[PDB]
Amino acid sequence: RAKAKTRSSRAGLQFPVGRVHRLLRKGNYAERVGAGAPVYLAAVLEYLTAEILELAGNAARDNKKTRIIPRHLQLAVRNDEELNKLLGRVTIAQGGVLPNIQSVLLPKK
Amino acid sequence: KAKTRSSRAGLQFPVGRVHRLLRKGNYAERVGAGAPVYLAAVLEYLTAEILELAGNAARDNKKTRIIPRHLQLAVRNDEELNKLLGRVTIAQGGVLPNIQSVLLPK
Amino acid sequence: KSRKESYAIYVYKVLKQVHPDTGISSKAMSIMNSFVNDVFERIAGEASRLAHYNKRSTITSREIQTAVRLLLPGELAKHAVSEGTKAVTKYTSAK
Amino acid sequence: RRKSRKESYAIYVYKVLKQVHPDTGISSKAMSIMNSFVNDVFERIAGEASRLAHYNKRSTITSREIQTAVRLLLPGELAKHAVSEGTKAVTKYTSAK
Amino acid sequence: PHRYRPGTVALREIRRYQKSTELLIRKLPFQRLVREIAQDFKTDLRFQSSAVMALQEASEAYLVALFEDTNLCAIHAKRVTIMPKDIQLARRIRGER
Amino acid sequence: KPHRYRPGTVALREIRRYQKSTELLIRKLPFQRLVREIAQDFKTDLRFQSSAVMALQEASEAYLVALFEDTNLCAIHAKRVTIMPKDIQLARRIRGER
Amino acid sequence: RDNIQGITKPAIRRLARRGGVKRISGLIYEETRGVLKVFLENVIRDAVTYTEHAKRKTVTAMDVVYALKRQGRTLYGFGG
Amino acid sequence: VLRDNIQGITKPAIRRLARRGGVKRISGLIYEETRGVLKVFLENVIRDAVTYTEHAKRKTVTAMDVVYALKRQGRTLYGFGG
DNA sequence: AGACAGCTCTAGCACCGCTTAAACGCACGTACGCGCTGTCCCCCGCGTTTTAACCGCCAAGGGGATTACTCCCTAGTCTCCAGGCACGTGTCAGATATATACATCCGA
DNA sequence: TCGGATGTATATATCTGACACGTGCCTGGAGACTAGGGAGTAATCCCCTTGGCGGTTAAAACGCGGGGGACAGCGCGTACGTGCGTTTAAGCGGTGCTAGAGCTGTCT
């Protein structure tokens, strides 16, 4: 038998190409699913995961914490203009909200 | 003798087409025989409600032909069709005649 | 094929039953055709959710009845379920 | 009896985390959110890919359908980067052994 | 000669334009605007007459709905005059910003 | 004269505290009983997974928080600090919830 | 029953404070309860409906997630 | 080359839309504000429509492209096909 | 389902002439934004009270998850034929034009 | 007040091209039958959910003082509505063309 190597490794991806391919076929999104669709989709999912995790890890380091928690995920998602738009209709459990106070609310003499 | 499934169900809507569409719309790999019959009945019911309100609006407007204005007036006046079609825009529909009491003269 | 599929005949027949003296403009007819197609996709879409959420591989009256109760408001749901169950009752009993 | 396996992207979210922040960990709650996010985005891109295939009366979802769904769903710069990453992955996947 | 006091013709115009469904923006200027914007995304694009009408119907409905929401928040501020901040507020509350 | 913080000074601090923290602000037991009270109106003898009551609380609190933000925006727009019921109704109406 | 009144006034305040509200009129509490009651009814009714379709007697977290997913707001952190 | 055609949407046109929307009095500032809003709205809808057109590899923007774009944005339009 | 060749023939873009309503610049008035002031109420902050949320530990039973068994219901294939869908047609509904009522607003 | 301007709704008659009726016909609906596995049924278990007790102790409720922010009333000035004459190009009808939508067939 030839040397077994995963499709993800060929694409230079960590995300499971097989699981994405199966989920597409099992979700019945279309009568047929091309071999390029799960590779492209896995790459997009992996990139978006790295994008959020990087911003979340930065927020964690900025908060002097060693683990990314729901709060760090919420701050990372809401602080980025594009992630906030992509996840505008999404609620993150235990994430809270961004520290925000309107100028008229701040104290005065 | 072949008798259409629509007449068997007492429906005007094309049960065969509804079944065809459900089979072709990839909603599932299988479609139960009762599904298109049930769906067609709901589609026919909603159609009758829409047209009934539209026809009544046309008669109130002394018109005998339903135009987009009547459909819009019907959909927006009915407190439940409005909620179902809240995200829907009807071409040439316009809006409900409504001016806020604060804008009217003293 | 070039064939066009539309609910023109069915909307007209229902209109004749609802108001035989009343007609419908080709513009209002195209709206109704799009409305039927839209509502059909909503119910079929929700029905696909229900089947998948319960890992069922088929759409039955239960999926439609549930999707109708989810998408349609209270009175529309009650009347639609009544019409749907009645239509299935006659369809099954009439053989 | 024995509990059935429940698949999740946990190991993939962690492996990607080790790439962006080797020193940083992730709590189970945050992992559940990332798993939820991956599955949510997957359904959205796949959902739009279905619509595109259907609108063009196509039966097969290909890279073009995914790329178009990505451009439609993702914002401008995210779309450009995602498209570049997807294109690099697919091109390298096809050219590699 | 005879002159209508401020707000009289406005109310009459509201009734007239609400009682009527025709398109209020000139078709040719709107068609040019659509083409101008479309050329940014892709040059030499052609627009079906039905496609331009679709954009205008949606745009007029969208703006009319936005003006309704704007009027609601203008009345809330105890004003009859709509201000840019009113449009900005409605768009932010609507979630489109 | 006993030292007392001026009105709103503690509120400004409370805002930072609650915005900094992420714990749920409604008590689990009152919320859980409310869920079952409403659920009883749709189907008798219903059971709720421990996590299902939590999911309803997370969404309910996030919804009310998001609603209060939009409500505060329209309250500020009316040149007011205090949010009133008409501000909530306006925010809900403009949000497309009615 | 009283469970609607069971959501304490400080709990509403804390939500308002997290929402950035600096001052709250005494009428916001009754209004907020009504708003929450109709919100919970819409989500519970769908969750109960998803439960009934499954012929189950317990409302799972997924049933609530799907109810929210359909209600137009997605909740992350509960799986699925 | 088409340029500065946004000013082609006359003030009376914006007035009429506002009048249909029930607006009694319109600030002179609203006209430029409305053009910017519409410019963003049309950019979003046309970007999606052109995206469907490009995916279909067509050079003519079809009416269905606008309907699908409006549908995707939660503003579906009835009257231009199913 | 697209690469390639080819046909149709639609209809989108290109262009001019004319019409005239819509757009425009400007006149000009007072309606209406809002800055300022007054005020009172009702909302905050805290002491004080208390209660019920919370923790922790145990019961139990039922319903959910599971395995085992079955079969009846649907997809696939085949048969068939008249329902529905482009074409043909005409007639009558509401657009357009005209006349004229009335309700709504303005200058006196 | 209040009567006159004077736009919008309505009523009248003519018209006209829209849709409602009449037709041809073919392909998509209905009928028949099968395979088969999905779905239903039954028994089992167990776990987690519901229920209870204890208790304590954080949070909520309640009372109160007062001050600050909601909002009534006010002045004004400048912005916006409305009216007019100007003029502009959109709207309309007509003519040109051929890009490229849509389709077929291959075909691979």
Side-chain angles (χ1 to χ4, degrees):
Chain A
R1 200 188 186 184
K3 187 65 178 174
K5 183 158 49 181
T6 68
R7 283 194 283 183
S8 304
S9 73
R10 285 180 189 77
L13 300 178
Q14 299 304 332
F15 266 65
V17 171
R19 190 170 292 172
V20 170
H21 182 219
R22 188 197 75 214
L23 285 169
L24 285 175
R25 289 187 287 108
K26 288 288 187 173
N28 284 296
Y29 293 105
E31 183 164 71
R32 287 154 52 87
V33 180
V39 173
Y40 205 113
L41 182 52
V44 170
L45 289 170
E46 172 159 327
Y47 162 69
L48 285 169
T49 298
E51 194 68 30
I52 300 189
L53 290 178
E54 182 188 3
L55 291 171
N58 289 346
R61 292 189 303 104
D62 295 342
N63 280 270
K64 298 179 294 281
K65 303 301 178 71
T66 61
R67 290 194 178 179
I68 289 163
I69 66 152
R71 173 53 169 197
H72 304 143
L73 294 175
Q74 177 76 303
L75 296 183
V77 164
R78 304 302 157 196
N79 282 296
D80 183 69
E81 294 188 308
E82 289 165 318
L83 291 171
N84 186 36
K85 191 175 298 183
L86 174 62
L87 301 176
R89 303 307 304 148
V90 174
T91 292
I92 294 175
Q94 299 288 297
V97 297
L98 284 177
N100 166 252
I101 307 183
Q102 303 297 333
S103 61
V104 72
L105 308 177
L106 298 178
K108 294 285 90 175
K109 294 97 66 177
Chain B
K1 196 61 167 63
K3 178 146 42 66
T4 174
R5 290 190 282 177
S6 300
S7 73
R8 274 180 158 85
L11 301 176
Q12 304 305 290
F13 271 53
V15 173
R17 177 192 289 180
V18 176
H19 186 199
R20 173 179 53 179
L21 290 184
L22 286 178
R23 283 185 274 105
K24 296 303 191 66
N26 302 311
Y27 301 105
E29 55 171 293
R30 297 165 83 248
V31 180
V37 172
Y38 204 116
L39 183 51
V42 175
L43 294 178
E44 187 174 297
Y45 171 65
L46 289 168
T47 299
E49 288 297 346
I50 289 272
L51 296 174
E52 180 162 85
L53 290 167
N56 291 345
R59 290 190 305 102
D60 284 344
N61 292 20
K62 60 178 68 69
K63 266 65 181 178
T64 204
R65 183 172 288 143
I66 287 169
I67 56 152
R69 181 86 188 118
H70 305 143
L71 296 174
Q72 182 81 311
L73 285 169
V75 166
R76 305 306 159 193
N77 274 305
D78 183 355
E79 74 180 19
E80 43 182 2
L81 288 169
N82 182 30
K83 199 184 304 290
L84 173 61
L85 305 178
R87 308 309 310 163
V88 170
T89 296
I90 293 181
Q92 279 275 64
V95 298
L96 286 190
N98 179 75
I99 313 185
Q100 296 305 130
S101 307
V102 179
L103 310 180
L104 301 185
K106 65 185 174 68
Chain C
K1 299 190 290 286
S2 61
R3 301 182 59 264
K4 295 303 188 205
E5 202 87 34
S6 74
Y7 293 84
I9 298 100
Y10 315 109
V11 166
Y12 204 84
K13 283 188 187 288
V14 174
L15 182 58
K16 292 300 93 174
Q17 289 185 357
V18 169
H19 289 138
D21 59 6
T22 301
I24 186 163
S25 172
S26 57
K27 309 305 290 285
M29 180 60 253
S30 182
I31 284 154
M32 288 300 297
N33 181 64
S34 72
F35 160 81
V36 166
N37 274 291
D38 175 58
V39 172
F40 166 86
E41 281 185 22
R42 295 190 210 189
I43 295 167
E46 188 58 46
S48 73
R49 278 187 178 126
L50 286 165
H52 182 259
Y53 295 165
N54 299 109
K55 303 183 183 180
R56 194 66 50 64
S57 70
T58 201
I59 305 296
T60 77
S61 56
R62 285 190 73 91
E63 283 73 22
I64 301 300
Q65 173 154 358
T66 303
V68 164
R69 279 180 170 155
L70 289 171
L71 297 166
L72 310 193
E75 280 302 298
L76 286 178
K78 287 169 54 62
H79 297 143
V81 163
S82 301
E83 287 289 309
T85 52
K86 180 172 55 177
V88 175
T89 299
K90 195 176 178 171
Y91 173 84
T92 50
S93 57
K95 181 58 180 180
Chain D
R1 301 196 186 112
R2 182 66 64 77
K3 296 186 179 70
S4 61
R5 279 177 156 67
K6 275 66 171 181
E7 294 194 320
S8 68
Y9 291 93
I11 73 166
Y12 310 109
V13 174
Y14 208 96
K15 280 188 189 183
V16 174
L17 182 54
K18 296 299 92 176
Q19 284 179 17
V20 301
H21 293 295
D23 65 343
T24 301
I26 181 167
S27 70
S28 175
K29 302 300 191 177
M31 178 57 75
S32 180
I33 288 153
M34 290 302 299
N35 189 61
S36 306
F37 166 74
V38 168
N39 275 105
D40 180 53
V41 172
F42 166 87
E43 285 168 21
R44 288 159 72 176
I45 298 167
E48 193 58 33
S50 180
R51 274 169 228 130
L52 291 165
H54 179 64
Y55 299 162
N56 293 114
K57 298 178 178 179
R58 303 305 189 77
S59 68
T60 310
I61 280 167
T62 75
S63 52
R64 294 256 303 156
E65 283 70 33
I66 302 298
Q67 173 167 355
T68 304
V70 167
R71 282 180 189 277
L72 285 166
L73 293 165
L74 307 194
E77 201 62 14
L78 289 180
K80 187 188 308 297
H81 299 337
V83 161
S84 72
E85 292 298 312
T87 307
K88 179 188 293 292
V90 173
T91 53
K92 87 178 290 179
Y93 171 85
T94 303
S95 62
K97 190 178 181 292
Chain E
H2 180 286
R3 159 179 275 267
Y4 284 113
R5 302 185 298 135
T8 284
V9 190
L11 285 162
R12 198 162 60 219
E13 277 176 11
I14 291 162
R15 295 186 185 98
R16 176 184 175 185
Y17 298 121
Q18 287 186 340
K19 201 78 72 176
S20 314
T21 66
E22 82 285 36
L23 297 178
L24 305 178
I25 308 167
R26 295 296 97 224
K27 297 188 178 73
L28 199 55
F30 186 93
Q31 179 160 218
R32 286 194 298 271
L33 175 61
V34 165
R35 300 248 191 63
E36 187 193 2
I37 289 173
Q39 86 202 354
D40 300 342
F41 308 130
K42 187 167 162 62
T43 52
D44 309 341
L45 280 175
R46 296 182 187 266
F47 279 76
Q48 293 180 339
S49 51
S50 54
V52 183
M53 288 301 102
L55 287 167
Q56 187 165 355
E57 295 265 4
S59 301
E60 294 198 14
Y62 166 85
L63 290 181
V64 168
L66 178 61
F67 283 123
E68 287 169 26
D69 295 343
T70 301
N71 182 234
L72 288 174
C73 59
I75 295 157
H76 183 245
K78 300 181 65 173
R79 283 190 280 100
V80 296
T81 308
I82 65 165
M83 304 294 293
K85 49 168 165 273
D86 309 332
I87 295 181
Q88 289 154 26
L89 178 78
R91 291 189 75 232
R92 169 56 188 73
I93 295 185
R94 278 152 65 99
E96 53 175 286
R97 178 183 292 272
Chain F
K1 292 185 179 180
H3 174 275
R4 162 179 277 262
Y5 284 108
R6 284 174 51 70
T9 310
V10 191
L12 276 156
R13 190 165 62 227
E14 276 180 17
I15 293 162
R16 293 295 193 184
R17 301 211 306 110
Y18 290 116
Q19 287 186 356
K20 192 191 297 287
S21 74
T22 72
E23 85 288 33
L24 293 171
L25 312 183
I26 308 163
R27 297 285 172 187
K28 301 191 182 46
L29 258 61
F31 184 83
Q32 183 172 101
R33 291 194 300 272
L34 178 62
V35 166
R36 298 198 182 155
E37 180 190 300
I38 290 171
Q40 181 62 24
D41 298 343
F42 308 130
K43 184 157 175 38
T44 185
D45 307 298
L46 275 172
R47 286 154 61 88
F48 281 83
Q49 279 188 335
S50 307
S51 54
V53 185
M54 295 302 292
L56 289 168
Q57 192 167 350
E58 291 279 351
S60 298
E61 291 192 17
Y63 167 85
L64 284 177
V65 166
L67 176 74
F68 280 125
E69 283 165 13
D70 297 336
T71 301
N72 187 232
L73 292 180
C74 69
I76 285 169
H77 185 73
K79 297 175 60 169
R80 288 186 284 99
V81 178
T82 313
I83 63 166
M84 255 78 82
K86 57 165 164 278
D87 307 339
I88 288 185
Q89 294 163 14
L90 180 69
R92 293 198 76 221
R93 165 56 189 76
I94 295 183
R95 279 164 57 133
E97 301 186 18
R98 299 184 85 245
Chain G
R1 315 174 188 172
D2 216 21
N3 306 293
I4 188 60
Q5 306 301 120
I7 290 188
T8 73
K9 170 177 177 176
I12 291 164
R13 287 176 81 79
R14 290 189 289 271
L15 290 162
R17 296 295 190 234
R18 178 168 282 159
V21 179
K22 196 177 70 167
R23 197 164 183 272
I24 304 170
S25 176
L27 298 102
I28 288 285
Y29 309 114
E30 291 295 304
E31 190 74 17
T32 298
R33 282 180 186 111
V35 165
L36 177 57
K37 179 162 179 303
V38 306
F39 174 78
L40 280 177
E41 276 166 24
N42 292 330
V43 181
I44 294 164
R45 190 194 308 112
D46 287 11
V48 167
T49 298
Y50 279 110
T51 298
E52 282 172 1
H53 175 258
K55 306 209 203 68
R56 282 194 276 93
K57 293 205 181 61
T58 197
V59 186
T60 68
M62 286 321 300
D63 300 334
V64 174
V65 165
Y66 299 143
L68 290 166
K69 187 68 159 289
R70 212 206 63 72
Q71 185 64 10
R73 63 193 78 243
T74 299
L75 178 68
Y76 289 179
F78 288 93
Chain H
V1 177
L2 275 62
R3 184 176 64 253
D4 192 35
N5 306 105
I6 184 61
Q7 293 303 328
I9 294 189
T10 76
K11 159 177 169 184
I14 290 163
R15 293 177 73 76
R16 290 187 292 272
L17 290 161
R19 293 282 185 251
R20 180 175 276 159
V23 181
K24 190 177 180 187
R25 185 169 160 106
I26 303 158
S27 167
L29 306 170
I30 294 285
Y31 307 119
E32 203 53 32
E33 182 68 358
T34 305
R35 282 178 197 114
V37 164
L38 177 60
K39 176 64 152 47
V40 167
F41 175 80
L42 284 180
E43 277 170 16
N44 294 341
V45 180
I46 297 167
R47 187 191 309 115
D48 287 3
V50 172
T51 301
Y52 289 112
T53 306
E54 281 179 317
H55 174 246
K57 291 187 298 181
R58 280 190 276 100
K59 287 181 276 300
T60 310
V61 180
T62 296
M64 291 314 293
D65 303 353
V66 178
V67 173
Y68 298 146
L70 290 168
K71 174 183 183 176
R72 204 194 70 80
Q73 300 181 11
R75 289 189 183 88
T76 194
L77 180 70
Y78 285 180
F80 292 95

